[PDB]
Structure 1
């Protein structure tokens, strides 16, 4: 009997105590009504409907205690929330008796929001029992309720035909406008003849339809009605009455108009945008431009066999319904069905005579875009020139170098483009030579080469942009690899006449820092500039003499709080950020993790506002405006920041802002539920645990504006206890001091600090447009902000760090 000659591995606070007291107990009517009563008064649960509270009530657990047994200690980490069922319980703060609690009373309120160290000890005087629930269970139950409600409502949005032409984002936005409405047997949901404006969808139960007091049919779960009442003012065709207990998801037109705008206008824009984008011309148009074409297009119904067009200043034609046949003279050239379109030729050549014929094959609906309709869309009568102008604008607005310049700067630059032609085999650029030109390929193809082939570029690609910022050797060659290639080009001399010093300095310094492929051994630490988490060192790169910042995240710090999956997700977000008002990552290192970023030398915004005192309107516009662009950028990439506060905003050498610290930031996929952020800045929806998204940063924006204009924080300014901060956030009164003289500032603050996201400015389908166009910003040039053409509020004299 031989043995195994290997080896075999071995195996190895408040929740432990409540386990000793837990017992099974069937809940009666009297128990449920007590729970229901107690939760209706609770900070988080007061807004919840009966079915939500009844669900939460069921997850409560029975805990039996003897007189003298410990329930809660003072200084231990909190977790349970309690409702006293029987007996008496005494509260001893600092080993000193204060209150005596009995049947109906509650304690451990804060535990339902976050892990908090308790204040006092609760002891049991007589033999008594508690109804209890943990945080985990409570937050999980609130998550599941709201999340399933949302998913169920969205499926019903999908089953309703009138919403078919809404986008993903539009459907998700109106899913939140769904209100659940309960009807007992006998209750009439809608009555024949009433001008109602509400769609209804049966989740569970059945309801009977009555036209003229006569039963037509019965309606089962999934059946819906009132979709026409979201579009038009019309009487109800029927009287719908509930047969059994029924739950209805409902959408009112009033809320839809707030959230989405006019539903007919939005649907048509989507239909028209999709059609117009089939043409290569209108793909380059902006969303606004296409929306304008949709709003002003002439819509017409034609009978069959009608000459819609023959030999009229129509340039483009879209089939909304039916079929039309296209003719060149007597030759049929094709049939256009629903969604197809015609007119590329005439859109591009404004003055060209319409040579084609369009004839309806059946009864049809057609959208027509005229010459005036394009001119109004584009802002001038020279359609051919504007389309060319915009084609170029679309190309350069994708490049960092050009996309943040003012519109006036961008227009002048486009106008300065000159065209040249090349024979096949011509070196457009030769490597090693010093360039002074930026190129965009109009026609043909080119080959990028070095020392062998690297790439191939064609129509609307670009190259050589670095020559506008630097005097350096071309790292590659550009050989014309086609028949007769044409490039648009702009000279450096022209670029330098258009761009001004501050923007040029920003670009010079920013594009350079990707070139320096640094290594850890090439960095020398000058001084420390931050502490924590870890430490931030100012470092000096020996080869290039460029100065950087080096954050030092410790391994033992990250592994302690289990932030394993969060540091990798943080690196991803931080690396992808490429906006002028967001910190730019250079590279990372490991051995402790490291972030190498650009050096920001003008200190925190926390200190700047404290140097300035109360900000004037122009100063608040500048800083809040700057934060808006950074936050907008992140929201467009589905990133919620979650920790917006002045501490997390640095100022650069020129006085422009840099958003830092993306530890709390997250790539949003649906509704987020985790409680993160800094309490004073946290949005109500985060605290209430029913789901949130990018809208939280807009609340935070409001908190910042309040600090800027008013001085103190709007909620919990005096408070240190986190429970009392959240309370003031949830139910406190928003007030403004007597020295705040600006009506528009207060209006904006109130609407940014709207508790429910649906009524919050910037949280509708228009997004930040509504914030940017608010009267507070009436005299504010957003165009000049991004391009660094505004005097900032404060310019730092020398460098400044914490």
Structure 2
């Protein structure tokens, strides 16, 4: 006897009763393959993929006068008739009679939907069915196991060793699985091929001049030099048994990556250049230019590559292969091996005479960067001033205040910096005084103090006092010189105000104020309801008199839909977002959930395009360009939005966009398979269920551009049924109205609405640069957009709300 027990706690249950085991014969597999080819999502799949889906189909036995489907109840199965007959009845009235070969319940595989008509067995028959969960999981596995198999083979190949993880994953998607039956030539000797083949499963025989050299098993490959150069095949490879080979073509590689020698050399040179502290601060575009214009030469052993007289404008040297011994006059100062480099002093001092001497120890391959190579890269002959200008640029470009300014405004601010020295113990800043300067440490260390208590230390390239440029508030902490004679680059408020203009200054002024206000729930007074779904309310902060927007996500709504973990990941995405065209979060409360954000008063983008009607080229460029930068920012942070549409975009008082709904957004790490988003704006790869990445938002971008230029949606405008919207997205024809007279608009819209993500614009190694450099944006200034220097299409007269 103890004083201290706990109790324990639709369509699937109905089909479970009719289920029965049966051996999958050859005659049964043939009719499944035939009917699945007529299906909407299995048409794109190959025979090996359809053969796997045929094995997971379960056999169901029915009797004459038995209910199969119910009208209004959720749809989870898709059936293929084997024997007997099934009459379709709609609203208690007959419609059609089916037989062997036909199928029904196609929409259930893509998404959960209520059926329209009932299906009853008229005669004694049997069905071949498959569930949504089982079907979608099999597509996910076929796609995931194929990509992981292909990626493992891309790693085993030696020509792709210097490619990055992102570059390796892109060429894995370009793989095409080519099947070869016994006694079928894969490649012939003498032919000029452009394909790389790897054995996934099976055996193949080699034949140089019709003589057997060896036998190739799984893992072996051939055609590395075919992807690089136009050379003939050294042997004739023939299949001994039924082989399957993963094939990468040079034509598809040029679309995804471009010239492979250029991409590999850019990675080699970037890795070699990033070892030096000078080129560590250079941008990726600048480092690629140096690699594209570097002089690569081969030298024998014991050869003076560079001598005091025979320099020929060389400022930097990188060893690609072999070894070189560095010398100063007649004294050795080091030995550089593969990857190592030299020249930092000559790169920094353009006019300095070359005193060192480089001599090869063995046969080597050396890359050389001259002064003209550095001048064309930096875009100015004064290399010493440009490197110092880039060093300052690299520091200020990492800060929100100067990141989004135009390059002209950014260069004037960099040119306006002045250096000043501070002795030991000198107060740069004193807490309580109203400062008017922003500082960047050039050389030395400085201690941060408040009430005689050391909070932290700042060294070379660190910065402080950026708030003084936007306000006339007193300094919070004092900055004392810890080290001797510390140098500091500084810019006055007067100078900053002359460069920056009204719109951007207003955006920075009221945005940076939000981080200082300490907000608790008790002082937020509710003015009015602005949104509804889950509800958004306009709130007034009584102490600071600043107006904000407050979301109210109900806990019962999250628990009912089973979004306990997804709401936690939404908080992580929304809080980390810090971009001028994305909503800025202040603080999140809980007890139901809440999200306090900035108040966006200019109205909705949905209503803005209705007020303007069909947008023109300057108006469509502005809104799509504003969306591109917000989506590019999320793609750079490995976040996929999955729900891009004008309904989830608001306009601010200045007329600039603001992205807001991050419910469907997710931090991607590989390939996502969950079907989410709005049907009209969803991409085909989401519907097909064979994996998708950040490329889905570039499809929705094309759908937005289509609405702006043309008016209606490109796929299923009048259609309300999800199946018919999804059918128009996959099998439908993309057409354009007769009033659209611009070629560049149509060319961009067609390239953005390209079903295959490999061939879609902006889904290559270059990324959004391909969309940004398109003929549609020829006259568009991307610097002036982010810096709030363009006149927007529509400006709100006062405030607007839904």
Q: TM-score band, normalised by the shorter chain?
A: over 0.9
Aligned to 1:788: 788
SS at match of 2:677: coil
The C-alpha deviation readout for 1:430-464, integer Å capped at 9, x for no partner, is 00000000000000000001010011001100000
Equivalent residue in structure 1 for 2:275, among 270, 273, 278: 278
* Cα distance between partner residues in 1 of 2:468 and 2:205: 75
* Cα distance between partner residues in 2 of 1:351 and 1:283: 22
* Cα distance between partner residues in 2 of 1:261 and 1:596: 45
SS at match of 1:308: strand
CA offset at residue 313 of structure 1? 1.0
The C-alpha deviation readout for 1:321-377, integer Å capped at 9, x for no partner, is 000000011111110000000000100000000000000000000000001000010
SS at match of 1:368: strand
SS at match of 1:141: helix
The C-alpha deviation readout for 1:398-446, integer Å capped at 9, x for no partner, is 0000000000000000000011000010000000000000000000000
* Cα distance between partner residues in 2 of 1:411 and 1:196: 50
* Cα distance between partner residues in 2 of 1:718 and 1:267: 49
Aligned to 2:489: 488
Aligned to 2:2: 4
* Cα distance between partner residues in 1 of 2:19 and 2:688: 27
SS at match of 2:476: coil
* Cα distance between partner residues in 1 of 2:490 and 2:412: 13
SS at match of 1:441: strand
CA offset at residue 27 of structure 1? 1.2
Aligned to 1:553: 553
The C-alpha deviation readout for 1:200-250, integer Å capped at 9, x for no partner, is 000101100000011111101100000010000000000000011101000
After superposing on structure 2, the runs of 4+ consecutive aligned residues of structure 1 that deviate more than 3 Å are none
CA offset at residue 760 of structure 1? 0.3
CA offset at residue 524 of structure 1? 0.2
SS at match of 1:759: coil
CA offset at residue 388 of structure 1? 0.3
Aligned to 1:572: 572
CA offset at residue 4 of structure 1? 1.7
* Cα distance between partner residues in 2 of 1:504 and 1:380: 30
Map 1:581-660; keep pairs closer than 5 Å. 581-660=581-660
Structure 2, gaps ≥5 residues long: none
* Cα distance between partner residues in 1 of 2:364 and 2:591: 69
CA offset at residue 261 of structure 1? 0.7
Asked whether 1:40 is paired with 2:41, we answer no
SS at match of 2:741: coil
* Cα distance between partner residues in 2 of 1:377 and 1:437: 32
SS at match of 1:719: coil
CA offset at residue 786 of structure 1? 0.1
The C-alpha deviation readout for 1:563-589, integer Å capped at 9, x for no partner, is 000000000000000000000000000
CA offset at residue 715 of structure 1? 0.2
Map 1:99-118; keep pairs closer than 5 Å. 99-118=96-115
CA offset at residue 11 of structure 1? 0.5
SS at match of 2:113: coil
SS at match of 1:23: coil
* Cα distance between partner residues in 1 of 2:20 and 2:217: 41
Equivalent residue in structure 2 for 1:19, among 16, 19, 22: 16
SS at match of 1:146: helix
CA offset at residue 591 of structure 1? 1.1
The C-alpha deviation readout for 1:460-500, integer Å capped at 9, x for no partner, is 00000000000011000000000110000000000000000
Map 1:159-178; keep pairs closer than 5 Å. 159-178=156-175
SS at match of 2:159: helix
CA offset at residue 28 of structure 1? 1.1
* Cα distance between partner residues in 2 of 1:177 and 1:535: 44
Size of the aligned set, in residue pairs, is 797
CA offset at residue 519 of structure 1? 0.6
What's the TM-score once normalised by structure 2's chain length?
0.99
* Cα distance between partner residues in 2 of 1:675 and 1:420: 59
* Cα distance between partner residues in 2 of 1:208 and 1:598: 67
SS at match of 2:562: coil
SS at match of 2:114: coil
* Cα distance between partner residues in 2 of 1:27 and 1:154: 33
* Cα distance between partner residues in 2 of 1:189 and 1:332: 55
* Cα distance between partner residues in 2 of 1:448 and 1:261: 50
* Cα distance between partner residues in 2 of 1:517 and 1:268: 51
SS at match of 1:503: helix
The C-alpha deviation readout for 1:367-390, integer Å capped at 9, x for no partner, is 000010000100010000000001
* Cα distance between partner residues in 2 of 1:511 and 1:104: 66
Aligned to 2:315: 315
* Cα distance between partner residues in 1 of 2:476 and 2:6: 57
SS at match of 1:474: coil
* Cα distance between partner residues in 1 of 2:182 and 2:31: 27
CA offset at residue 282 of structure 1? 0.1
CA offset at residue 603 of structure 1? 1.2
CA offset at residue 12 of structure 1? 1.2
Q: RMSD of aligned C-alpha atoms?
A: 0.4
CA offset at residue 141 of structure 1? 0.2
CA offset at residue 151 of structure 1? 0.2
Map 1:77-476; keep pairs closer than 5 Å. 77-310=74-307, 312-451=312-451, 452-476=453-477
SS at match of 1:163: coil
Aligned to 1:501: 502
CA offset at residue 30 of structure 1? 1.1
CA offset at residue 701 of structure 1? 0.1
What's the TM-score once normalised by structure 1's chain length?
0.99
The C-alpha deviation readout for 1:605-652, integer Å capped at 9, x for no partner, is 111000100000000000000000000000000000000000000000
CA offset at residue 602 of structure 1? 1.0
CA offset at residue 70 of structure 1? 0.6
* Cα distance between partner residues in 2 of 1:669 and 1:442: 38
CA offset at residue 108 of structure 1? 0.3
* Cα distance between partner residues in 1 of 2:444 and 2:83: 86
SS at match of 1:460: coil
CA offset at residue 710 of structure 1? 0.1
The C-alpha deviation readout for 1:62-86, integer Å capped at 9, x for no partner, is 0000011110000000000000000
SS at match of 2:214: strand
CA offset at residue 160 of structure 1? 0.0
The C-alpha deviation readout for 1:125-172, integer Å capped at 9, x for no partner, is 000000000000000000000100000000000000000000000000
CA offset at residue 29 of structure 1? 1.2
* Cα distance between partner residues in 1 of 2:445 and 2:170: 44
The C-alpha deviation readout for 1:516-558, integer Å capped at 9, x for no partner, is 01110010000000111x1100000000000000000001001
* Cα distance between partner residues in 2 of 1:680 and 1:798: 32
* Cα distance between partner residues in 1 of 2:601 and 2:64: 63
* Cα distance between partner residues in 2 of 1:489 and 1:334: 39
SS at match of 1:589: coil
SS at match of 2:205: strand
SS at match of 1:550: strand
CA offset at residue 89 of structure 1? 0.1
